[PDB]
Symmetry: C2
Subunit: 219 residues, 2 copies
């Protein structure tokens, strides 16, 4: 069948998740001071408990960010090491889309507004809406900008959206006067488990990369 191993260290969360035909085996935690110090243990626990072998995985999915500059790269490096080891293609998954896919998993959100607390007053933003087939649209809306522009962009949308990401909690004032119906997507950080559905789909479409060109996204 089809097997995909997902890894994410892009934000304050570090997570691993194995998709095995339909069986999802995942772990999720907040990364300690030594950011990725738990990733390998998580990978070892998941592979052993699922009785799966790296030799039998079909592709490595990795969190491409945006998020922490340091965090993201370490996770990617780990994924590359594993992927070169098993001669496997890699799949870069947006942390914003991942959180969007997260909202739809907990409740049923279809129109997500991803906001991650970035650098300065800046913020990683994205407008994601999944179609009927369950595919997320709006990857082009991804960008890094100030809460003022966030306020502007928002007043050019419609209907009701659910919110995800640290951005909203950092500025609960971000929604104020957004001129839109807003709820709580119940997703603060992205999880590898949610990379799986996206990865699966990208693997089916050929949206993969050679280990040598796996890298963070540049907003």
């Amino acid at each position: 069948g089809l097997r995909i191993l997902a890894i994410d260290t892009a934000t304050e969360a570090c997570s691993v998740a194995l998709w095995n035909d339909g069986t999802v085996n995942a772990h999720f935690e907040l990364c300690p001071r030594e950011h990725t110090q738990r990733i390998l243990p998580m990978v070892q626990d998941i592979l052993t408990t699922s009785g799966t072998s790296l030799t039998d995985i079909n592709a490595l999915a990795y969190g491409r960010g945006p998020g922490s500059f340091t965090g993201v790269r370490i996770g990617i490096g780990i994924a590359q090491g594993l992927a070169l080891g098993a001669e496997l293609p890699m799949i870069g998954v947006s942390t914003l889309m991942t959180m969007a896919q997260g909202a739809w998993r907990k409740n049923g959100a279809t129109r997500v507004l991803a906001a991650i607390d970035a650098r300065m007053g800046e913020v990683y933003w994205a407008e994601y809406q999944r179609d009927e087939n369950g595919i997320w649209h709006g990857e082009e809306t991804e960008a890094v900008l100030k809460p003022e522009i966030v306020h502007e962009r928002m007043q050019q949308l419609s209907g009701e959206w659910v919110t995800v990401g640290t951005g909203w909690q950092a500025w609960p004032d971000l929604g104020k006067e957004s001129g839109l119906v807003l709820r709580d997507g119940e997703v603060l950080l992205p999880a590898a488990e949610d990379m799986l559905p996206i990865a699966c789909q990208m693997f089916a479409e050929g949206k993969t990369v050679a280990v040598e060109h796996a890298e963070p996204v540049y907003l």
Copy 2:
């Protein structure tokens, strides 16, 4: 097929990104620069070297990695990649000092036996080390590794004696660090660590059983 010590080393602790394999008496290495942590080039370098030597990751005896000190991000990316490469093949890992690595490079290039290693740690400091190669080719001075201010480096050099060679970006970040040290200093011809130089150190550590499991690969904390 033909058995023999096989050790794969990679490093991204500094701006440099290098890889090297010790395969049956010979050294096969690549050295490049990876500015702004764009370390993806480590993977093709590893692949090419493996392919050229007819070596498989499963044939490796140990994977040597950069333990630092160096860039906060760089050292961790390197460890991450090394960990990824070691899991499937269950490769033992060997942490090699970035500072010691440069000392080894100085010996390689000019037979230096007493090395003053200094890395621009940024934010006003430097990673320091005093390494002396004994007759058996063993590097002493690891216990001297520390993070300190230039003025403190100056004070410490005055407590030193003899002739030394300098290596690392530390010296260029602080040009007067050598002046009035009371020591006779020559350039060691090493600005940044190179995987090639991790190999000798790694062979010796593997011989002494100084290794760790994948999940225990860690950066040094100074």
